[PDB]
Design a protein around this ligand. Structure first.
Ligand SMILES: CCc1nnc(N)s1
Lengths: 172, 171
């Protein structure tokens, strides 16, 4: 994945989020610190929040990331699309986990109720563990895919089954 | 602990530490002019070659941080292996491979002997992060079996289009 996509992935709360443009930041609702009253030097009064279940979008009053161009945010992706989940790991390592996307789903995972676009990891027989699959600290990482002439972002990482291949992408 | 620390840049490709003293790679990536590897003179290294599979056994512990792993001659048909691709870009790319028969295959016009496989990303796999490139040779094929990771070969070749790969094996 191009370096401009990795540069958008930002350590945030108990996981990650992703800069869509200089003023727009998306993340997984449950990684947001509940006590927080300031983000990137802006008080909550200067920020518009758009939330659908595990999807949260922040719109800032001023350019926070003026080095970036706005890119395309889709509401999920077509059934059968292969995405990469852009996960940052121990020691500046970059782990773009291949995922085939499927249906909109509601599931119970580790006792929590989750809703978004389901997918299956294409990394191994089972993705149990940190070498082939996801860990809790990966939530908020972006789902991206390559088209003929550009890259699209279509959601953020919300949940994964243990001893499985199944993931849930939260979508706008 | 991580399998990824075992994947090491080597020659024109990569190799894999099975144990503190044993290193496996693809024959064609090995430098053809050398007097030492990893600070050890070639005079104290044992080299075992079988076509595109090479194993080095060192006289001293190069990676004393590691435990010894299971090394087998390929795996049963229909096993879904993972090829652990390390990239100079800074990416780690684990890809699922459904394994087939051992054969002599024509790949981009050359004969390659090893275990066939097909990527689950499929034939219309579209980009650097869904398939292999020539610099990836020597990346290990692994799978989990009964509590243990098994290494069953090293990346030797791949088709230009479609989804075929070849794992070089021992013996
Ligand atoms: C050879 C140095 C590297 N470490 N991790 C990578 N992906 S390249």
């Amino acid at each position: 994945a191009p370096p401009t996509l990795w540069s958008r992935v930002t350590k945030f709360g108990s996981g990650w989020g992703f800069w869509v443009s200089p003023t727009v930041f998306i993340t997984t609702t449950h990684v947001i610190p509940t006590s927080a009253k300031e983000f990137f030097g802006e008080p909550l009064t200067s920020i518009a929040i758009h939330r659908a279940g595990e999807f949260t979008l922040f719109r800032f009053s001023k350019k926070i990331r003026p080095d970036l161009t706005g890119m395309i945010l889709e509401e999920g992706c077509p059934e059968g699309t292969v995405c990469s989940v852009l996960i940052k790991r121990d020691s500046g390592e970059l782990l773009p986990l291949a995922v085939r996307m499927g249906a909109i789903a509601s599931m119970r995972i580790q006792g929590r109720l989750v809703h978004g676009q389901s997918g299956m990891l294409l990394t191994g027989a089972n993705a149990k563990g940190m070498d082939l699959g996801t860990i809790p600290g990966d939530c908020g990482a972006p789902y991206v895919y390559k088209r003929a002439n550009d890259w699209v972002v279509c959601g953020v990482h919300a949940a994964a089954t243990k001893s499985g291949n199944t993931v849930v992408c939260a979508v706008q």
